[PDB]
Symmetry: D2
Subunit: 331 residues, 4 copies
Amino acid sequence: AALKDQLIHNLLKEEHVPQNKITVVGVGAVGMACAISILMKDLADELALVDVMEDKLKGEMMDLQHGSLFLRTPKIVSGKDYSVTANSKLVIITAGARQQEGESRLNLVQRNVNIFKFIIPNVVKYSPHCKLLVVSNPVDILTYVAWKISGFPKNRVIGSGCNLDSARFRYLMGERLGVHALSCHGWILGEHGDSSVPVWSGMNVAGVSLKTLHPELGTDADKEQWKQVHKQVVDSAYEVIKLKGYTSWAIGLSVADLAESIMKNLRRVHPISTMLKGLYGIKEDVFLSVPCVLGQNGISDVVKVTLTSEEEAHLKKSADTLWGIQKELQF
Amino acid sequence: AALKDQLIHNLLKEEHVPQNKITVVGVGAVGMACAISILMKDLADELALVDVMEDKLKGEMMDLQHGSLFLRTPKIVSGKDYSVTANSKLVIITAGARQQEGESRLNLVQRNVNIFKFIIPNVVKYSPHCKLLVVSNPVDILTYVAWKISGFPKNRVIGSGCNLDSARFRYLMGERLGVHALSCHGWILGEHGDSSVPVWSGMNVAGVSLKTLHPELGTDADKEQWKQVHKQVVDSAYEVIKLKGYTSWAIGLSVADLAESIMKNLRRVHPISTMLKGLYGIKEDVFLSVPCVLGQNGISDVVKVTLTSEEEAHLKKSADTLWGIQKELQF
Amino acid sequence: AALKDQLIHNLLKEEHVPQNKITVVGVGAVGMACAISILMKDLADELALVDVMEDKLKGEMMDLQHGSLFLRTPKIVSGKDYSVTANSKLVIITAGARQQEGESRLNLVQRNVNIFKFIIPNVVKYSPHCKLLVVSNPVDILTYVAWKISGFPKNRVIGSGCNLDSARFRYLMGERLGVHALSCHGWILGEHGDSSVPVWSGMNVAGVSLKTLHPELGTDADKEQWKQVHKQVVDSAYEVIKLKGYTSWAIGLSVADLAESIMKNLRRVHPISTMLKGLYGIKEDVFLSVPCVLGQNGISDVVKVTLTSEEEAHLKKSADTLWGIQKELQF
Amino acid sequence: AALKDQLIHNLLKEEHVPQNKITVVGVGAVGMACAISILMKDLADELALVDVMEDKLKGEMMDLQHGSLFLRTPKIVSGKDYSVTANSKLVIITAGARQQEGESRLNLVQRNVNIFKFIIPNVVKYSPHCKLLVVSNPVDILTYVAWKISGFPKNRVIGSGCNLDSARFRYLMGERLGVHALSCHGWILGEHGDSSVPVWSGMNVAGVSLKTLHPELGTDADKEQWKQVHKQVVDSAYEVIKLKGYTSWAIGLSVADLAESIMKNLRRVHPISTMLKGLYGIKEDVFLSVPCVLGQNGISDVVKVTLTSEEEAHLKKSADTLWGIQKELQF
Ligand SMILES: NC(=O)C1=CN([C@@H]2O[C@H](COP(=O)(O)OP(=O)(O)OC[C@H]3O[C@@H](n4cnc5c(N)ncnc54)[C@H](O)[C@@H]3O)[C@@H](O)[C@H]2O)C=CC1
Ligand SMILES: NC(=O)C1=CN([C@@H]2O[C@H](COP(=O)(O)OP(=O)(O)OC[C@H]3O[C@@H](n4cnc5c(N)ncnc54)[C@H](O)[C@@H]3O)[C@@H](O)[C@H]2O)C=CC1
Ligand SMILES: NC(=O)C1=CN([C@@H]2O[C@H](COP(=O)(O)OP(=O)(O)OC[C@H]3O[C@@H](n4cnc5c(N)ncnc54)[C@H](O)[C@@H]3O)[C@@H](O)[C@H]2O)C=CC1
Ligand SMILES: NC(=O)C1=CN([C@@H]2O[C@H](COP(=O)(O)OP(=O)(O)OC[C@H]3O[C@@H](n4cnc5c(N)ncnc54)[C@H](O)[C@@H]3O)[C@@H](O)[C@H]2O)C=CC1
Ligand SMILES: O=C([O-])CC(=O)C(=O)O
Ligand SMILES: O=C([O-])CC(=O)C(=O)O
């Protein structure tokens, strides 16, 4: 004579299996920005949260659960034990140390490799068929580490890479031209960070090449100093870190953009971090951002951008640098 | 001979006035959760942020701007000067002062009052026709303060009140009954906080009154202790604060839900705080939560809930309490 | 040498297995309204359309495909062969004869039964684990037919039932009370059509019983004639058909609302048609609308509404009528 | 003691002026596709419908209104009298004449001019500050007619033009290359119809010029017959009309995309029809599609695409053709 049984006649016993489950590992500033953006876009029917800080983890789960009335994601769970992540379609890794003022992303590598040695084997134990989307920095090296530790085929291990760098670039381009970032096109490839490569030849509005219109585009002799736009992209994370201490909102939206292509099988092209040995002249097994076709099987194809020999030389050097960092990691 | 002029032929001298602008005052955790929720629901054509901490304010603005590609809000602005808020349709106040240094809370409430003495006159000078939505705690007193300082008619000064408390209640009801919060209906009215009034008579699923089905509902004599659920709602913000240090996500989602009713003129009913002198037996200038019809002119109507004499007595006690605190403030 | 291969390096060959596929059978007025509503709510990663009219089917598929840029459903497929429907999560049946002006949904029965004799065995052959959502009229009898022909457990065979009748009722109530339909609650149960049952006791705003406030609600002696609102609901399909020839938009939105609860596992309560024997006093195998909990396994629970002796008598006579038709059908 | 007055205490006399109103003129298949697309994107707080067929018009309004529960547009109105359209921000014209047996093509165009001679003065009388968006065919000529009759500045009169042709082109490109239409870029300019101009130089994926990679792109001898893709675009409407009798869904989505840029002030670039005299080598008052920056003041800027002499020559011949049809017309 419980109220529930007076009210509700049960017709079916429910061994609930999740169908569109996403996990976020690390519920820091980045992790929670990814979680709220994914929740507000209705990409998942179950969201699992993992962290090592147990009280913070339960507090973040509860705060999200209290907003359930306003969401269309019926189940949010969390735990330190990765059993809560079982049968995820997509596992997003945002755990780790972050930059202080003046610190390069590459200075984070030793701390975050050691964290990944713990995280990745636990992920693959409960979700052996998931896609891994790596956001923790340095993202290109850590996508390689996730790949090696997981044993996954390379199509299922993705780094957020330069998706956000390109979005920042398009925003800054739009502010200068007086149009929305959506209508500005421009690709930043290579390392997410100081050594990223702007592809000046591809920048356009409505298929009109900016460089064809303004041949000094991207050079030091440019009176409008468009080269500084890329410098603002490179510097932007450092400037936000100095002002507010960290970055979170933009990366959350960028990660949810990637999750949407994966979860809906959109086969959109994004500049994300993938194993590009054998492409673009690279001979080592390094992860760099190039335009990739992203869908329900991860990265299925890569677009072959025509680079100048200078643009190609920048990528070739990055690959050497990153491969040099990778070579001496113990995992 | 600039690139913009090579690319773009300007046909129209642009004198921009925003049509659907929202301002958030305070870029703490609550203010930024409101802003991200509003941005992801496409409620505004311009978002303005204001705070007194200039560096954090610029950093939060830039972080949102870098996500523009992923949004459909084309203009995000910020500044210490309220000229950036001009012509807002809706202004959301989340600013407040921190209150734990061996200090009386009567002095604290007074410090938040002094904060509002600066904010509200600046808001009304640049947006004299806006709706004001007060989220800062203690929300019922500060909604009153905003109303007195602004000189706005009462339909245009709204407190977030018990909107989130009711949502938390519906979530917990649904966890107990095995259905989504959307399908559990239940109203927490009165003072936001420890003395809020759960309206047991109205709680229902599918129009079925739970109290008619379970006449013990809301008493201590209930073997199932549904009264404890209201206690859980009252305690939830404290529990989240103890675990993660503050709350943000649920309040942000709840505020964006109120903003949606306002901006789209939906005339949905929400439990929010309104000046209820002359209603529900109240004779003083106090704000408490009742079900209100919310649209483009703010609160246009109040639903008259049939309360028990006990429930009505709770509301009148709160009203006496609030009026006693307010009388010893200064404007 | 081909352009595609100069442009794109393929990194893996994968066979497409859809994860969130929906099929619509019948691409007439109702089917296409369902299709556009589902596409604009992003509920599917693949939409399959089936009809017997081959030119119309290809024309509707092509017209949706040309709008791909504006959608986030990457694959729209169609054909007369049910192989295109393989592995659907949800199959929506909108095929069959409709009401000519004045005619009861009941004279359609045998013609639409004959159609289901071909559709349903083809559906279950290619999607043995799907949920079936029957919209074709008379919907309560045809949901029974689909259940008998399919051999599916009753939780996976759903009729659109009174979801739309209740939505129409809430709209009309809101018009009279000056509030959005979202905030008006009221349940129409039983037969979709002339013999549906309004549950006056459950009608409410903000948990305030209208009947408690207005005792003649639902009686002939009511000076406001609220009973005429239920007659407007019963008559609405007839009035729209007389004006424009058929109805489509409202049913499409109602079906997409049901599809959303299923695909996202929301466990929302909807008034839909389910096999009711053993509940509400019914003795025979009939389908009628009661509040059902709807999720990824279909209908898992039923809300037990407390009915008046008169309301219960109406349901029992409907059950008798329906069983009277079913007894006479031939598959 | 009416029920409404028992239930609701009115606080405010409603001088309701709509803030985000859209009107659709013509409720045939195209007009209703525009309406449902606009409603499901939450672009308007009021939708007004107008037609000359009073019965069909009332039936379509009622059918949309019955779906209010599932929408977030609180007011849908309709009528033969243009008073229902007052204070629209945007008026979409989809009305047109039905061709006759043995009716010269020019006599038909004159019958659409005669229609516009009635519609446009009524629109501008009740919404003198609106934007006009013309969809009726032949769209370049009728946008000119609307501009002349309205007396509006050219920034406020927009033709749907080649927006949908370019979307069809991108869909077809994407089918051939294996990526989403979103990631394929390509512009069809000029006259909507058989003489539109595909801008081969601008076609790209990820900023990679297909013409640079495949320099015979767009020629007759191209073993990949990419020229045939344009021919498919110009023919696609006729193919769909032959199969299903009319086209509606893609144009509806296309129009709602334009309405979104206007209503949200996005300043996105779209290929739409604008009064181009003085640009692209054109000397007469004609409307042609070029990439335009679209926002709350209509078309504020035009992108200057670098065309080949051949493409440029095609545009000028269209302008000559159109100007010759117009000077014939009686206003
Ligand atoms: N790819 C990109 O564009 C960007 C990446 N990041 C990076 O994301 C990472 C996190 O940044 P924030 O969220 O700001 O830091 P945070 O300090 O707010 O949170 C980091 C979380 O990682 C958790 N964590 C640490 N070890 C863990 C473990 N073994 N297992 C599970 N969780 C663990 C921590 O408990 C903490 O809650 C950093 O590497 C940051 O550099 C930050 C912004 C943009
Ligand atoms: N009503 C509700 O349901 C809840 C309301 N809150 C309240 O919201 C308020 C803010 O909470 P948090 O964002 O976590 O605090 P916080 O400390 O993170 O940020 C508060 C912001 O207010 C700013 N501020 C102080 N003086 C200002 C002034 N003159 N002008 C403009 N800004 C000023 C501060 O610079 C700070 O950025 C608090 O009063 C909190 O109790 C907390 C969550 C839910
Ligand atoms: N449950 C509700 O509230 C509502 C239900 N309806 C019903 O929906 C059903 C469809 O109505 P409309 O779309 O207006 O009719 P319609 O005539 O426009 O389309 C019916 C489609 O069914 C197709 N069809 C016939 N046999 C088929 C078969 N073996 N396999 C596949 N497709 C087949 C037809 O070729 C046609 O395209 C009717 O029974 C109608 O009464 C009408 C509106 C509301
Ligand atoms: N520009 C584009 O890309 C596309 C535009 N169209 C065109 O849109 C227009 C409508 O096409 P459909 O909806 O399929 O035609 P339809 O025949 O279904 O509807 C035309 C509507 O206009 C109404 N109408 C006639 N005179 C009127 C007047 N003085 N005032 C108000 N309404 C009036 C009619 O009563 C009718 O309801 C046509 O010109 C069509 O060729 C269709 C294909 C794509
Ligand atoms: O973690 C950071 O803030 C640095 C970074 O990758 C970014 O925001 O671009
Ligand atoms: O007390 C606080 O700071 C938070 C609060 O009002 C809530 O989340 O209910």
